[PDB]
Amino acid sequence: MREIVHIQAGQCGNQIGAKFWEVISDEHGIDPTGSYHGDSDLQLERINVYYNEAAGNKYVPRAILVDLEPGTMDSVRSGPFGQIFRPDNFVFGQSGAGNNWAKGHYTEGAELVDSVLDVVRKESESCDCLQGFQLTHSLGGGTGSGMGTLLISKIREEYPDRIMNTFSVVPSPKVSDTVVEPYNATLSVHQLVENTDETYCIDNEALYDICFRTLKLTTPTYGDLNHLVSATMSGVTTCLRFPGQLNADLRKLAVNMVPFPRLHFFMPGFAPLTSRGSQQYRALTVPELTQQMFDAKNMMAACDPRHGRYLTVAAVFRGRMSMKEVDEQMLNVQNKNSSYFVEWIPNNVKTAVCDIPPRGLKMSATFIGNSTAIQELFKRISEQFTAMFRRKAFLHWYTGEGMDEMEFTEAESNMNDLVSEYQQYQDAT
């Protein structure tokens, strides 16, 4: 019951999931063959949410992998935990997006989505009582923007009751990978605000800080950066796969975090994070977890929470602990930071307690914030969008795929209306 279908899109969304399914497998004791070799009997108690039991007592992940070229798909199936996926789910094309939103959403996305939706519907029938969908993609890329938002527009037309959330990767302030990423993000945010129940904004630039300032890694790779994103994702549905004193799931967090239907962009945070040898110089208690979830250097989105105001806060705890020591810390951060919250929402902190820690640790927590400090994320993009659209540069790669200039004006109008809403409730009281 309450099963989750996982969809991966783009180059980044595939390499997150190749790390993500390795993370979930150690929470259930799954070899790269696909059998069960755990030790605790609570691992197979709710195994059916992310896995389908096959003949011979093997378990296969409920994952769907999308690309437009066989390059990265050949890397996943040849790497470790590539022999766990069903070979039918590898859906791919031959053209390649070319890092462009137009060819990802109009030209090649339309000729691929029917091959995908025949696989999505096959996983949708097999589930007993389907909870909802989740998606891992980019916003600066060509595939994960175009093909990603196209799948969301087809799903919501079929399953309006199911929850739809994306662990998207948002572009960075200082450096930039895609040159035309102000076009790719703006035409994708216009789709995400009308079709997603909640959205996790993640910046790579905020992840480079934690790998250097906190964990003191001299040489972090993407296998280490995408490891932290997958640790946040498992900490969201950890109260759906294990019993707890106070249980939550994807639907409870979709209600307590969204006061208005357009304001559903978040910021994720994970705790505890120390160095390798520098863990013995620090106790691991509940106020040690609370003081790390609220400083600005722990957010996975490049935005300072001290500028804006929080609307709602979801704290999802793991492991054996005590409820008063939670409420000793969850109330205290609402008293001393009394101006940094919003006033007309009393007790805007949501508590979720699971019983099972991750493998090896003693306890852990997961921060799902919702603030007006992400208006700087959109004001930085909308300034870069108008600085490029007014000269009409890089536009013949969009006009040459059947796209009028009214379509750009609608996305730019939709983004500025979103900025005005977060500007309103920041100075409101």
Binding site: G98, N99, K174, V175, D177, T219, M388
Partner: protein
């Protein structure tokens, strides 16, 4: 599965392609006999037996240099129905390359390309190697780029063109051939890359300490640039790039599609020690004006977009540190309307060293593909060379006599002048 054939036109194309396909064999352990004792599936079509052949079409109008491949060391590698020759050369003449001689064998080459296009399913694009100064590389290439946009159209047609040097010119009619071949390829090409000879003589003298370079030593450094661009199709990388992705990120306006190449580090064998060569150390050598492979001052222009191709042991975090310092310098300046001017690619494989070569074995290298407005000063010098010779109507009777209307020069010159003022439109800033 993502195949990409290459076309080599003229004498300049073949002698570069000799060093290129020599380098591709060593990056996969391929014997010169086609054997080896599928990552390489993009550039080699496997036979029924254990033998691999290149996806290349060597075409030339004179039979000298093609027979050297037919008689040299790399003899049993190529398909002999691909080494297309001609009776006589175009002899530094666009009209003989586009009207007289080229109209005889153009239907044969298109037959050979279309047979290679059928057995490949993920055909990305074309790679044309030629030179602006030669008769074949400017005449026959301009005929060839017409037919491919008619037939294929949706394929990424690239060019590693040899730009004519500012001061060191061999053929006298190089101001004529470069104007004529640019007016033809402007409506057909996608992203043509510029490489100059005279700057490579400056690099091989100052860095490599070779005071006697040949065309062989120039073809080694050019083949490193060819290798690093096609490195993402041949090997797995942490952040890959496709040949379709170059024409999206580097071409802002449909006329201006002339970037330039830059490779680093270029050091000798004994200078491979005495320094550590970090990714923050070799990145600043790319934006140094002394290492740019076109004789143009980059501080006279503004960078529109820049591609960075890392390969080898490259940390993704320190690339973010290295790019961030370059945006803080004051000599390097971008254009006002472009806030994001970087395209980053990381591959795992280090660049190998050809035996009997001159570069040292390193662990990392950068290929930079930058599209700047600093080339607009060089086009104006080319128009100044053209207007002097054409005003006296010199060498025109070798062009009109080979099937060409004499008024066609006013078509190409005025279009180049209209191309000249387009950079002046780009060079001004925004409003408020």
């Amino acid at each position: 599965m993502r195949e990409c054939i290459s076309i080599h036109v003229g004498q300049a194309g073949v002698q570069i392609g000799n060093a290129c396909w020599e380098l591709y064999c060593l990056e996969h352990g391929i014997q010169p006999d086609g054997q080896m004792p599928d990552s390489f599936n993009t550039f080699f079509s496997e036979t029924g037996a254990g033998k691999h052949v290149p996806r290349a079409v060597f075409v030339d109008l004179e039979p000298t240099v093609i027979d050297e491949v037919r008689t040299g060391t790399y003899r049993q590698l190529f398909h002999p129905e691909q080494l297309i020759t001609g009776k006589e050369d175009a002899a530094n003449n666009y009209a003989r390359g586009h009207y007289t001689i080229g109209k005889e064998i153009i239907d044969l080459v298109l037959d050979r390309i279309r047979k290679l296009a059928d057995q490949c399913t993920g055909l990305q694009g074309f790679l044309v190697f030629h030179s602006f100064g030669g008769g074949t590389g400017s005449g026959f290439t301009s005929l060839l780029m017409e037919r491919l946009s008619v037939d294929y159209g949706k394929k990424s047609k690239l060019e590693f063109s040899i730009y004519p040097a500012p001061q060191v010119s061999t053929a006298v009619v190089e101001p004529y051939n470069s104007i004529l071949t640019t007016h033809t390829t402007l409506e057909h090409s996608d992203c043509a890359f510029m490489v100059d000879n005279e700057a490579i003589y400056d690099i091989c003298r100052r860095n490599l300490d070779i005071e006697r370079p040949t065309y062989t030593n120039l073809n080694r450094l050019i083949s490193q640039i060819v290798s690093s661009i096609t490195a993402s199709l041949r090997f797995d990388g942490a952040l890959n790039v496709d040949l379709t992705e170059f024409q999206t990120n580097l071409v802002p306006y449909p006329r201006i599609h002339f970037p330039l190449a830059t490779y680093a580090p270029v050091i000798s064998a004994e200078k491979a020690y005495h320094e550590q060569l970090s990714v923050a150390e070799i990145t600043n050598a790319c934006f140094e004006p002394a290492n740019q492979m076109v004789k143009c001052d980059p501080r006279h222009g503004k960078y529109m977009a820049c591609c960075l191709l890392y390969r080898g042991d490259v940390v993704p975090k320190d690339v973010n540190a290295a790019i961030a310092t370059i945006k803080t310098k004051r000599s390097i300046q971008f254009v006002d309307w472009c806030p994001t001017g970087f395209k980053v690619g990381i591959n795992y494989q280090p660049p190998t060293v050809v035996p009997g070569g001159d570069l040292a074995k390193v662990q990392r290298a950068v290929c930079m593909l930058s599209n700047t407005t600093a080339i607009a000063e060089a086009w104006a010098r080319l128009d100044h060379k053209f207007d002097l010779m054409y005003a006296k109507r010199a060498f025109v009777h070798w062009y009109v006599g080979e099937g060409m209307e004499e008024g066609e020069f006013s078509e190409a010159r005025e279009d180049m002048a209209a191309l000249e003022k387009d950079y002046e439109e780009v060079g001004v800033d925004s409003v408020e």
